[PDB]
Write a protein that binds this ligand. Structure first.
Ligand SMILES: [Ca+2]
Ligand SMILES: [Ca+2]
Ligand SMILES: [Ca+2]
Ligand SMILES: [Ca+2]
Ligand SMILES: [Ca+2]
Lengths: 277, 276, 276, 275, 277
């Protein structure tokens, strides 16, 4: 016999330089307050009278969700040659409540006749998430520049037909939860150096939604130079939109259905040359 | 000539540190007892009168399957510095009876007219499995908070419109076979550190189902720290739901159709620092 | 100025320890004899009167194909400590006649109206192959236990509603070509240690079929322990089912359409501890 | 400072042992001659009267394309113990004219009504290519053995119901351009040792076609023994069929639409023991 | 304790040998001028009277976009045995405005009835981009040689039924923005040695569009010999076409919808044996 190693499993505290945060963001489909009957859905989609006259009603436009996570304070002040910053290195994220769509008894349009189950959520889907050290930078682009957007959303200022394409003046920050419509704003690829975003769109009138879920998948956030998002002011920005599709009522009115998203982000303390004047 | 090695194939009894279990879980679509005529299917889906009035009939709601496999006993003493635990390291799993869907003679809605084959199982599908060292932890979220769930399923306590999104109070453990509805409960990603789960959903009214089967594929259960699920009290929890779609009757009533799932899990004995 | 190697291409005969076999399996959709007008298709699918009364006509049920290939004999003496066995290490396989589906002039239902081409083969597809050193082990599972299967197919003995799920009593060996219905039998994932199988299913009433073909792809048959199927009694079992979809007649009666599959298997001699 | 390497870009001519060939093959959908109005398409698909009476009209059947590329001559006398042969080692291939399908103004069946765009090419698609050192070897298999094929195509000799499955007597070589129907002939997997073929099929009546194009992709032609097709008689065989779908006319008659394929093949000289 | 390395994050200059450019190209669907109401869309697609009489209206034909980016001047003149050239080595590219398609209120054809949402953009899609050191080389091929193309597009000269297949005389350079119709011209695979192009097509009358967006993906532009496009005259050519599908009006007339594309290209200075006579 001899002395040798055996690997024992035990609870390990990570080093002090590493932290994990967890958060969930509830959808902002238009009914955005938990007490509302249609929480998690938009109001009925009202369609344009004409191109000239297209006025979506209040709460009919799905908007991005965003949360700002306050991270542990790293610096006494900002006066040294270097400072400490949290660097986001990886994320596990999941759309929660996918199985809620496996429901054919909810009141709606019938698949066949009134003896059958009801048509489930389907049609256009849009799933995106972002993790950044500052607000996600947005580019404005719309289907129609003559749409009149309601007061409670942030739309493009002085919208003109050029906004049906890319006008570099149409830019915003995703700095408010449930205020920036998905149909008006998309991530700005000419910026976002300090954010990672990922998105998937499938269109079509009645297309079946497709979603996966697992707790086994991690997305590494390091860029091509091996650096993750660096959290300015010790703030982590989590952004998403998860439009599952539309639910159709028996009367054939339709409402958008959104689902919440969970994030679990690992961050590490980094020494960084002081970027603050 | 010289002495050399030649590899002879033989039945190897694995080292005592390793074990394998096999199990199958029958679906729990609502007719959950093998003596029932519609075993493997739900009863006819009854749809809501109104949002205010939505009362699914008993046995119309597909539920998760769960089995608890008792593993060989490891510790006759639970008071030492360390104890032994089974660590689940990999799994092979397969949906069984996929070929049973390849059937156009079963009575139902006709594809074209009364001379044609009948519409096979189609529509929404949902396939998930979990392997864990304790019950799968669940998060409640429903399409409508005003549904009244029957007393033979576990649903969200004190359900309110907030349950149409994520309310962190709506939590449960998958600790009962065939009692937790799929449409109410999903895996809770904020917990489940000691479980691995995998799921795939495709919706739509009439979507063709798509399924693969092979005995060549293994999923490794080790997490990012190289550790698999650790089986508390020497119990392995296997969970799943395999909704293949709906079958439509000639009358156009529809029933969910589920399929069984087979698991083959490899585990190894680990020395673990005692939690007590 | 120097002696050096140059690679010359020549016909190389493999080492004695390696052999290759080629085979093809014709489809067994119901018309299973090449003299039959509808060879390679089933007869018209007849649908159930009711759940209680579901009697598929003879030759309306697609069945698995199987071929047993005799390999060179290895052991004249079966009494030593070890014996030799053929180990299947890789397979190249192809569904043949895919291009025969690229045909819109064949009589049937019209795509648009009587001036258009005819609806091609489409709907439910099922493609599987297995390579093993013994018959593929099957599990019985049906869509309906009240179906009465005809006497020219092997069905589940003493069928009960429990056979709509997984009943471990409902087991068989794929040991007859064109007799085991696809809709009754699937590979048994709890056995088949000595076989590798691979299957793909897409359902739906009218789904477009999708198929690839190439002679550039090989599948390795080695399991997790680096061991391929071992051919008991020097017999190699090839199994498959390749249902391309259904053809629809102008009358709207429907028939299954199957395609042949080709196999090319490489095997190597192994020394194996003598079981008997 | 020190002597060191710096990489300068310049035109490099490959070694004498390596050569590249380019070719394109136009589709043979039935209208196979460039001066014909429907060049690149079949004639209207005429459907069977009955299973017994199924006679496709002339030029309604898409056929494989094949080109023989004559490579530089390698051997003076074929009586040496070894000879030289060209070995095809890689290919870049592309379906050309994919963008021609992005056309909703072409006359035809309307998507919604007479104010809308016209239904584009869709339905059954079939894309294959082969690169080999001899003709592609074909297996016959048909949907129906009682079809009567036209005189201008090569069909299965003495067709029988057995030809609805695999009959090993039904074999042919793809040695004539626009003569071997796709619906009769497929690559024979039991042969073709000296060829590489690749195919993709999607069926269905009205299925959307899906196609990719890029100049960044190369397929290596070496087999599991590290050897590519060897060009017998210094001849390279290029084969394909690229059926994009069917076009539907206002009258609802339908025609197959094919697209051309480009090939770029790299070959190297090899010393080969004389057959 | 000992002297050891610690990795500090800072803004790094990047060598003088490397440069990055960014650009966006707006779609050229037919309404190509920002002031036009239907900017970003074609005019209504008018269909042929017959095969012999097929005359698409002005501005109904989507065309390729192209931009020429002027890079930093590298050489005093072209008189030396070797010159410096920019070599494009990688690109990040994104279709901008994908989220704008997540809009069911825009006027149009109804999904179910006048109470429901409107049918979103769907049907034929075509997405391609190219990065090159000279104009993309094009091959002409049409669905019908008897179509009459408008004066304001570059069509195949002396079109004949042979142009329904590949005729080697039907060749062009993509050297004008919004002039070369997608349905006439495709990348010429027999040339384009000095360009990298990538394309995806999905046809069908009503097919749901599918698009991804992320800022985490880079395409390497080096060929099989390890060489990227070399920029002749210090000009980088960016080409694309991004047809999202068609929008259908209530009247059932249809228009093509295109979306802008962003490019971020990384280039390096190379010594090149002088190719200019
Ligand atoms: Ca920038
Ligand atoms: Ca947690
Ligand atoms: Ca077993
Ligand atoms: Ca052979
Ligand atoms: Ca060339």
């Amino acid at each position: 016999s001899h002395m040798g190693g055996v690997e024992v499993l035990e609870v390990r505290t990570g080093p002090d330089a590493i932290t994990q945060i967890e958060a969930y963001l509830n959808p902002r489909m238009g009914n955005n307050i938990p007490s509302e009957d249609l929480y998690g859905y938009s109001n009925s989609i009202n369609t344009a009278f004409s191109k000239a006259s297209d006025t979506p009603n209040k709460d009919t436009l799905p908007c991005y969700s965003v949360a700002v996570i306050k991270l542990p304070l790293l610096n006494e002040d900002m006066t040294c040659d270097t400072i400490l910053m949290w660097e986001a290195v990886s994320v596990k994220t999941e759309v929660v409540g996918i199985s809620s769509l496996v429901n054919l008894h909810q009141g709606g349009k019938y698949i066949y006749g009134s003896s059958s189950g009801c048509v489930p959520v389907q049609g256009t889907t849009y799933h995106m998430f972002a993790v950044g050290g500052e607000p996600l930078e947005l580019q404005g682009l719309v289907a129609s520049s003559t749409a009149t957007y309601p007061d409670d959303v942030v739309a493009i200022k002085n919208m003109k037909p050029g906004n049906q394409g890319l006008d570099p003046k149409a830019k915003a920050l995703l700095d408010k939860d449930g205020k920036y419509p998905v149909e008006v704003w998309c991530p700005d690829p000419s910026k976002n150096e300090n954010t990672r975003y990922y998105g998937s769109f499938t269109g079509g009138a009645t297309t079946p939604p497709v979603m996966q879920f697992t707790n086994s998948v991690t997305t590494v956030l390091l860029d091509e130079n091996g650096v993750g998002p660096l959290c300015k002011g010790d703030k982590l920005f989590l952004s998403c939109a998860d439009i599952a599709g539309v639910h159709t009522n028996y009367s054939e009115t339709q409402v958008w259905r959104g689902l919440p998203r969970y994030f679990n982000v690992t961050l590490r303390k980094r020494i960084v040359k002081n970027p603050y004047p």
